[PDB]
Scaffold this active site. Structure first.
Site, PDB file in Angstrom:
ATOM      1  N   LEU A 167       0.759  -0.815  -0.178  1.00  0.00           N
ATOM      2  CA  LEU A 167      -0.016   0.239   0.203  1.00  0.00           C
ATOM      3  C   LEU A 167       1.201   1.115  -0.119  1.00  0.00           C
ATOM      4  CD1 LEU A 167      -2.636  -0.876   2.697  1.00  0.00           C
ATOM      5  CD2 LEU A 167      -2.612  -1.119   0.114  1.00  0.00           C
TER       6      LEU A 167
ATOM      7  N   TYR B 153       4.695   5.484   1.187  1.00  0.00           N
ATOM      8  CA  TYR B 153       4.636   4.857   2.488  1.00  0.00           C
ATOM      9  C   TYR B 153       5.699   2.951   1.808  1.00  0.00           C
ATOM     10  CZ  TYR B 153       1.089   7.628   3.898  1.00  0.00           C
ATOM     11  OH  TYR B 153       0.614   8.982   3.645  1.00  0.00           O
TER      12      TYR B 153
ATOM     13  N   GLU C 212       6.915  -0.268   3.541  1.00  0.00           N
ATOM     14  CA  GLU C 212       7.161  -1.168   4.424  1.00  0.00           C
ATOM     15  C   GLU C 212       5.669  -1.548   5.246  1.00  0.00           C
ATOM     16  OE1 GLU C 212       9.784  -2.889   3.306  1.00  0.00           O
ATOM     17  OE2 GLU C 212       9.538  -3.814   4.777  1.00  0.00           O
TER      18      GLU C 212
ATOM     19  N   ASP D 154       5.002  15.248  14.808  1.00  0.00           N
ATOM     20  CA  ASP D 154       4.880  14.504  12.815  1.00  0.00           C
ATOM     21  C   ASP D 154       3.422  15.683  12.478  1.00  0.00           C
ATOM     22  OD1 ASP D 154       6.517  14.748  11.419  1.00  0.00           O
ATOM     23  OD2 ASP D 154       6.282  12.615  10.924  1.00  0.00           O
TER      24      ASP D 154
HETATM   25  O1  LIG Z   1       1.053   4.559  12.145  1.00  0.00           O
HETATM   26  C1  LIG Z   1       1.089   3.977  11.154  1.00  0.00           C
HETATM   27  O2  LIG Z   1       2.343   4.513  10.076  1.00  0.00           O
HETATM   28  C2  LIG Z   1       0.237   4.060   9.828  1.00  0.00           C
HETATM   29  C3  LIG Z   1       0.506   3.826   8.375  1.00  0.00           C
HETATM   30  C4  LIG Z   1      -0.457   3.741   7.926  1.00  0.00           C
HETATM   31  C5  LIG Z   1      -1.477   3.276   7.961  1.00  0.00           C
HETATM   32  C6  LIG Z   1      -2.626   2.968   7.292  1.00  0.00           C
HETATM   33  O3  LIG Z   1      -2.420   2.895   4.628  1.00  0.00           O
HETATM   34  C7  LIG Z   1      -3.005   3.030   4.997  1.00  0.00           C
HETATM   35  C8  LIG Z   1      -2.450   3.627   3.805  1.00  0.00           C
HETATM   36 BR1  LIG Z   1      -0.851   4.232   3.018  1.00  0.00          BR
HETATM   37  C9  LIG Z   1      -3.114   3.149   2.310  1.00  0.00           C
HETATM   38  C10 LIG Z   1      -4.610   2.736   2.455  1.00  0.00           C
HETATM   39 BR2  LIG Z   1      -5.414   2.290   0.853  1.00  0.00          BR
HETATM   40  C11 LIG Z   1      -5.076   2.390   3.565  1.00  0.00           C
HETATM   41  C12 LIG Z   1      -4.111   2.671   4.612  1.00  0.00           C
HETATM   42  C13 LIG Z   1      -4.862   2.484   6.212  1.00  0.00           C
HETATM   43  O4  LIG Z   1      -6.146   1.472   6.523  1.00  0.00           O
HETATM   44  C14 LIG Z   1      -3.933   2.515   6.765  1.00  0.00           C
HETATM   45  O5  LIG Z   1      -4.502   2.339   8.733  1.00  0.00           O
HETATM   46  C15 LIG Z   1      -1.828   3.416   9.183  1.00  0.00           C
HETATM   47  C16 LIG Z   1      -0.743   3.939   9.861  1.00  0.00           C
END
Ligand SMILES: O=C(O)c1ccc(-c2oc3c(Br)cc(Br)cc3c(=O)c2O)cc1
Ligand SMILES: [Cl-]
Ligand SMILES: [Cl-]
Ligand SMILES: [Cl-]
Length: 334
Positions: free
Chosen positions: A44, A49, A51, A155
Site C-alpha cells: 500500500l 509509504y 513497509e 509530526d
Molecule cells: O502509524 C502508521 O505509521 C500507519 C501507517 C499506515 C496506515 C494505513 O495506511 C494505509 C495506506 Br498508506 C493506504 C491505504 Br488504501 C490504507 C491504509 C490504512 O488503512 C492504514 O491504516 C496506518 C498507520
C-alpha cells in the site's frame, strides 16, 4: 542565565494525575501477538509509504493493515505502542489492532485498522472551501484528544493524515515521533519534517509542549488555502527560519528569542537580518481566491505565532469562527 522555563497552557498535569504505568513506556511489558494470524496481501501507499501492507487476519477473515518497523531502539518501539494503546478509541486516531514479531528475524510490526485513503497530498484539486474547513476540524478533534491525553504528536503533516473522501472520514497516523508531555521536561528538537517544524525547534528551545502541533497545523492550512506546497519552503534548517521570518517579520522573532532568553549562533543573527511582516493578504491570487476568507486569515494568524504560548489551543481553534458553520452542520446531521 540560561533559557527561561515554559509550561503548557492547557493539559499541563494530565500525566501527573494518572498512574505511573500510563506514561512510563520504558517499564511497559509488550504482549506480542501471533504473526501467523496475518498474511500479507499487497503493498500500500503507491510508493510513498515504506513497509506498509494490506493484510488479512485469517482468524476472522478481516482485512487489516500491517506496518513493518525500521530497526530503531527498543525504547522507541515501546513508546509508539504504548501511545497507540493509550489513544485507542479516540476520535480520528488510527486504531492499533495487534503487534507481532517475526519468528526468526525478530522484526516487529504493527497491525492497524483498514481505512480507505485518498492521499491528502493529492487532494486539493477537488477540495472546496467547506472541505478544507471540515477536514481541518477533524484533525483538531484528534489533536485535542491526544493533547488531553498528555501526548504530543510532533509530526503533523499531510503525509500523516489519512482521508477517506467518499465517507468523509479522517485518521491521524504515524505516532512514531510522539511523546508524553511532562512539565519541565526538555525534549529533542530533531522532530517533524523541515517544512512543518515550529520556531521553537529551529532555535533549539527544548522545553516545548502541545503547541508545537498547532504550528504544524498552521503550515498545513496555509499550504491548502494559498495553493503553495509547502508554504514555508526552506532548503536547510537555517533557511526554514529565514523564510518564516520573511513572512512573520523579524521583530516578533527577536521578541520571542528575548522572552525565553534563547541564545542563537552569532552567525544566525546576521543571516536572519531585518524583515518586515507580510500581511496574509499578499499571498492571495486569482487561483486561490475561493479558498480564502476573513475568518480563514484570522485563524491562520492565530496559529502561526512565534511564541508557542500565544498559539491557539486545539479547543480554542475548534471554536474559531472559521468553523462556525461546520460545527453547526455536524451537530444536526452526525
Ligand atoms: O502509524 C502508521 O505509521 C500507519 C501507517 C499506515 C496506515 C494505513 O495506511 C494505509 C495506506 Br498508506 C493506504 C491505504 Br488504501 C490504507 C491504509 C490504512 O488503512 C492504514 O491504516 C496506518 C498507520
Ligand atoms: Cl524527546
Ligand atoms: Cl517560502
Ligand atoms: Cl491543545
Amino acid at each position: 542565565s540560561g533559557p527561561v522555563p515554559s509550561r503548557a497552557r492547557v493539559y499541563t498535569d494530565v500525566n501527573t494525575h494518572r498512574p505511573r504505568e500510563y506514561w512510563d513506556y520504558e517499564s511497559h511489558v509488550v504482549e506480542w501477538g501471533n504473526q501467523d494470524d496475518y498474511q500479507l496481501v499487497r503493498k500500500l501507499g503507491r510508493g510513498k509509504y515504506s513497509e506498509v501492507f494490506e493484510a488479512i487476519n485469517i482468524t476472522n477473515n478481516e482485512k487489516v493493515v500491517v506496518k513493518i518497523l525500521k530497526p530503531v531502539k527498543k525504547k522507541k518501539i515501546k513508546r509508539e505502542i504504548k501511545i497507540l494503546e493509550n489513544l485507542r478509541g479516540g476520535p480520528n486516531i488510527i486504531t492499533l489492532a495487534d503487534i507481532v514479531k517475526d519468528p526468526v528475524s525478530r522484526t516487529p510490526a504493527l497491525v492497524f485498522e483498514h481505512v480507505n485513503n485518498t492521499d491528502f497530498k493529492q487532494l486539493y484539486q477537488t477540495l472546496t472551501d467547506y472541505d478544507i474547513r471540515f477536514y481541518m476540524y477533524e484533525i483538531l478533534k484528534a489533536l485535542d484528544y491526544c493533547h488531553s491525553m498528555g501526548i504530543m504528536h510532533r509530526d503533523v503533516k499531510p503525509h500523516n493524515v489519512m482521508i477517506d473522501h467518499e465517507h468523509r472520514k479522517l485518521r491521524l497516523i504515524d505516532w512514531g515521533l510522539a511523546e508524553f508531555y511532562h512539565p519541565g521536561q526538555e525534549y529533542n528538537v530533531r522532530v517533524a519534517s523541515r517544512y512543518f517544524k515550529g520556531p521553537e525547534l529551529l532555535v533549539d528551545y527544548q522545553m516545548y509542549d502541545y503547541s508545537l502541533d498547532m504550528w504544524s497545523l498552521g503550515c498545513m492550512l496555509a499550504s491548502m488555502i494559498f495553493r503553495k506546497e509547502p508554504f514555508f519552503h526552506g532548503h536547510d534548517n537555517y533557511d526554514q527560519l529565514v523564510r518564516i521570518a520573511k513572512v512573520l517579520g523579524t521583530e516578533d522573532l527577536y521578541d520571542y528569542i528575548d522572552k525565553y532568553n534563547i541564545e542563537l549562533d552569532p552567525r544566525f543573527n546576521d543571516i536572519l537580518g531585518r524583515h518586515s511582516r507580510k500581511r496574509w493578504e499578499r499571498f492571495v491570487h486569482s487561483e486561490n481566491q475561493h479558498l480564502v476568507s476573513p475568518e480563514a486569515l484570522d485563524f491562520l494568524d492565530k496559529l502561526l505565532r512565534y511564541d508557542h504560548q500565544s498559539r491557539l489551543t486545539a479547543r480554542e481553534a475548534m471554536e474559531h469562527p472559521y468553523f462556525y458553520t461546520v460545527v453547526k452542520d455536524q451537530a444536526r446531521m452526525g
